[PDB]
């Protein structure tokens, strides 16, 4: 079984920073890249970014450049996405999804997000 | 004759000089996919080369496969008995260069031992299993005779025998599987020999077990003989892998295989080889341009641009 | 045309080579492989740079001589 | 325009041709001193890298040091327990490339053994001592239990564990220190294992002893686990060295460190990197000119000299 | 000026390399390291020699052409 | 004359080198030796090709200039 | 000036251009024989380097030989006790580079063992023999004391000691030759040690035997000490080989040696070194032209050919 278990719900104040964590299980984190996808409540999915575990190279949307940072703690098979300078528009559900390609190619160009966190 | 806009190139005596027309010499972009022609590509889904070699259950689809380039995905994992390959890189390199997993089953006469030993960590079908290309010999009844078997190489190709030594976790398990307190394995040929003394000790818990398998290989040249002499802790081979010579190789890349024509394959995909130099990757297969550090090299194809 | 056919006869065809990416740290042999690959890459990068510079120099010299010759002859006629 | 005296250079079609002004392209002389900027130099006085790593007493000044280039003097010597490092070059290379001796002490639970064993050949202070980064476990009372300890790597950096195996000289000493007649050491991780069978035999007298220490290392990647299983002759680690990646390296040179600015350091000292080629030494550190065999290469910087 | 900036872009910056001096005799690996270093040194020495020769040739050709042109023009004036 | 004396100073004198022919299959070290030798051979083949091309180019340019100059001077006389 | 027929060369800007006179730059043919001057050639008839080193009977003519190039014929064979050299390539390489088989017999004091052991597979003269440079120590009477001998290196040249470990085929033979059930060998110096545990097991039948000899070497630097500590299965050395430094090397070639003068020797024979590049072989000895892949390279030595 491949599972992604995310942090608990966070309640913040505008201008603060939040950190959402994604704990993988059933596979090694460095084998798969990890995409982050947000969904404002009733506004459909919106792609946030992509962390390439095993080399740390990231790719965010221009809308989120600078104010979003993705890191991977390989020891605990955990991945963190922190958002600084929160706004009101950022209230949403955040999902970490597993993408296949880490070596040679950027995974999200050619592969889907087969496994999603809650 | 002149043109409105021009390209800046570099010469012996000029950092930048404008010319009418200039071409690029460095191929710095890749299509992102691996063309499956003309090179016989083998996509290894969830299977490393060694796992397919040993006969990992979820790799049973790779039996008797051949390839011109084995693409080994980053998602590959092992789901069988926790093994360990001393000199892993050498074994992987020579297996990949051989270019075939063609396995010929040989008749080995193991007398007084229980063949086809299996484990619950390597589940084949619904029940316990093992590597398909290895044979776990355990004590039969209450004795474990000193196995001493032989196989002559009468064919004119190299034979590759993959065997292993079982390191148990606890002395009780050692004496329960092999009555000798501390056995050993010795696989020898006319020209060389190799002896292993299995050790007993707890190891990091992997897939429910603390025991391990150490995987060794032996290459029997034509006209040579293999002699396997063990008194415990032997993971015997079932046959031999037909070694070869060719243009085969292996590559670690997550690029998806695609239906097209291309000669040069890098981990970033297939790239055209029209240009003499490339900047995509330093790992290449096939007729590839020479890797260079520069991302651009302009070759002047026209006269000096004086507009 | 391509003009490099004479200097680089073709793209030589290499099939099996050393490992150029390593996961763990081994020591002597890994360092040797890294050093060999880096040496090869530096030498080929330098060769490419010098070859491009030479070809550009000779091409511009030739075209400049032709332009000047044709200008003189047309002016004299 | 011409000049009275000229310099002889060499071209494609001329062995020697005189020109007005010519420059040199090969840096063939060194200042003789090593500039201590900008590269963080570490002068190792009387201490080899491995000696500072293990914690040799007269190297206690090097604890928790970091460097961009470790200069290892030719006068260095060892003045502790006579040790021996199989694959010495690999360990030295990777330690030097890590670039830090930062040692984090971990809590190891050794039950039933006497820790902090020491010897008179390695005199710390006035009394007997040992390497500061190792722990000599001997029998406690009259028993030596099979040590089986573990440490998980929960951080996201590699850990380097340095352990050792004690080869005694005489069987009496073996049974006096470790009650087992012939113990062994096994340090293993999820991906690899390493087992050593200590031997008993007299060895060349070094610093008053015939026994030896064999120094081994194990690198625990993030998320991995270390398991140490021994029943005698174990020189346990006390903690781990924080591995890193950087531009660090090591050099053997007796040149004295000096207060100045220079980018290229050779064993003959710091040399300027204005010229593209150098003839001083083939061992370099930093942005150094490429080593060449020729001692002179004249570049013409003027017109042909016809006086 | 220096004129070699175009051909050799800069002094590349190498930090950790193989051992190039050995005390004892090991065998295969030591011989491989010695061979690799000797190969690199020979190739770079040849490259340096050829580069200097080419630069000298082109510099003298250029200056000779300029001298001859200026002599002809001044003589004609 | 030979004309290559300036570029290649002499035939360098090598005595003990790595093995370049192997009977069995070893693995990492044999592959490293094969790769090193192949790299050296490719680099030296390229260097030889480029050197011959350059020498031919400069020789023909020089002789062509001399022929043209002598033709013009003899025609003018 | 022009000529009737011309040679086609290749330039930067021309694939083929005809010229009056053109020379060749690639030496692509060999005389087929190896000139025996000035390099001191040693023709090894039926003897490999290691066989002459150990003292194979049919190689007794090679004792105390020296060479500048050891030519090792393809017809060479071994006709003595079946041996095996772990790290064979390294030993062969360093022996060949040393350039001399000069063997100095040292006085070793083996007490309580029967020296000069021999076998029928290695027939010296009419009777059983052994390698001339090794000493097979067997039990004397009914005991085999733990040999512990030493030799200091007081000279200022390296010493090369060649020793070996005898692997018997059957436990009965083990206890008949060496009373210990399972002995071991340990050869150590101040800086390094090397221990071997002989194993007992049947091996492929070679020259009438199933037992083997494992040949190891130890280099004692000046001022160092050798200590040999064994309790069975020891093939002791008789002395040391004087190591050296020089231009010596080894070559595998069946070319016949000939009386002539030449500087460059390839396995295809001696070749002239007038041309800068050669295409004969990539294995060379002496002042040899650089190997290239091309079989022809035309250098223009005349003006453009317009007839
Ligand atoms: C073709 O495919 C290849 C293969 O994917 C592509 O190669 C990759 O290309 C990208 C983009 O160009 C590179 O990313 C860039 O890296 C620089 C600096 O990189 C340096 O570190 C790299 C990674 O090091 C980690 O990983 C290696 C290998 O796993 C490991 O050994 C290291 O120790 C280190 O490990 C750490 O991270 C792990 C993962 O989190 C942890 O587990 C571990 O514990 C450590 O913490 C390294 O690869 C790189 O280059 C080395 O290797 C290449 C060979 O690939 C070699 O050529 C070099 O000489 C080096 O030896 C460097 O050492 C980074 O700064 C860049 O960041 C830019 O962008 C960000 C935001 O986007 C900005 O904030 C930055 O300021 C900067 O602008 C960028 O991330 C990638 O390194 C490279 N290689 C790999 C293996 O991915 C190639 O690009 C493709 N080409 C085409 C045309 O498609
Ligand atoms: C020598 O020393 C080593 C190291 O201390 C010992 O190795 C440990 O041995 C114990 C048992 O012998 C192992 O415990 C088992 O761990 C399994 C893995 O658990 C990890 O992963 C799960 C998720 O998969 C996490 O929830 C958990 O926290 C761990 O991170 C467990 O799955 C096992 O559970 C089974 O047994 C327990 C027993 O009560 C049941 O309750 C469960 O339902 C289940 O049936 C078990 O907990 C431990 O993992 C080993 N560690 C390592 C590093 O290998 C050796 O045992 C010791 N040997 C001797 C002779 O002293
Ligand atoms: C197996 O075989 C080996 C080799 O033969 C034996 O090793 C020798 O063991 C003996 C004692 O066991 C050692 O003798 C000791 O040598 C020390 C070093 O001396 C050298 O250096 C000093 C200067 O520092 C010189 O003056 C001297 O000539 C040597 O060159 C001495 O310092 C020791 O002296 C101590 O003991 C004597 C004993 O009477 C006292 O008089 C002294 O005051 C002092 O307390 C001692 O002489 C010898 O060095 C070992 N040789 C090697 C090469 O290691 C093994 O013992 C043997 N083992 C078995 C089981 O048989
Ligand atoms: C463990 O297992 C191994 C492998 O099975 C056994 O090794 C074999 O041992 C037997 C005897 O112990 C060996 O038999 C001997 O073979 C010699 C070689 O024969 C080959 O070459 C000749 C030509 O030279 C051919 O004609 C022949 O067909 C073979 O190809 C023979 O020369 C020997 O003959 C001598 O003994 C016989 C015995 O009757 C006499 O008749 C003869 O006149 C002569 O005196 C003998 O036949 C066999 O070669 C071994 N095989 C290998 C691969 O090594 C181990 O014995 C076994 N050990 C244990 C403890 O079980
Ligand atoms: C510069 O030269 C290139 C090389 O031929 C020209 O590119 C080609 O242009 C033709 C136009 O007839 C196309 O059919 C080819 O497909 C082009 N090839 C490539 C590789 O691009 C380019 O047009 C020239 N530019 C100028 C301004 O003359
Ligand atoms: C040849 O050229 C060199 C390079 O510039 C000259 O050396 C410099 O000369 C100036 C004189 O104004 C000094 O200030 C610089 O410090 C010199 N630099 C070096 C690196 O030496 C040299 O003077 C020239 N010689 C002739 C005869 O013209
Ligand atoms: C082309 O040049 C070569 C090189 O000198 C000439 O070959 C030599 O010719 C002379 C004739 O006087 C002989 O004595 C030499 O032995 C030749 N040397 C070699 C290496 O062949 C050749 O004759 C010239 N050809 C033409 C047509 O001029
Ligand atoms: C072509 O010329 C135009 C102006 O004439 C300039 O803006 C442009 O950058 C040049 N290059 C291309 C590719 O359009
Ligand atoms: C693989 O091929 C061999 C012979 O080529 C054959 O004996 C064997 O049955 C084959 N195995 C499979 C699974 O096809
Ligand atoms: C300069 O010219 C003088 C003679 O005019 C000569 O003696 C000297 O060697 C030349 N070079 C230098 C560096 O003085
Ligand atoms: C070295 O550093 C570690 C942590 O960085 C610290 O725990 C330790 O006490 C330090 N040791 C010394 C001698 O400063
Ligand atoms: C020389 O010219 C003749 C014809 O004049 C031609 O047949 C021949 O091939 C040319 N070359 C040689 C080496 O004779
Ligand atoms: C070999 O030379 C050594 C000394 O150089 C000498 O003692 C020995 O007797 C010689 N052996 C033979 C066979 O000449």
Residue numbers in the entry:
A (entry chain L): 1 to 118
B (entry chain E), D (entry chain C), G (entry chain A): 18 to 324
C (entry chain F), E (entry chain D), F (entry chain B): 49 to 125
Publication excerpt:
HA is a transmembrane viral surface protein which is responsible for interacting with host cell receptors and mediating virus entry. Three HA1/HA2 heterodimers assemble to form a trimer spike protruding from the virus envelope, with the HA2 and the short N- and C-terminal fragments of HA1 forming membrane-proximal stem and the large middle fragment of HA1 forming the membrane-distal head.
Both the increase in the superhelical radius and the decrease in the superhelical frequency of the Helix Ds indicate the unwinding of the coiled coil. The conformational changes enlarged the distances between the membrane-proximal ends of the central helices and created an inner cavity with a volume of approximately 1400 Å3.
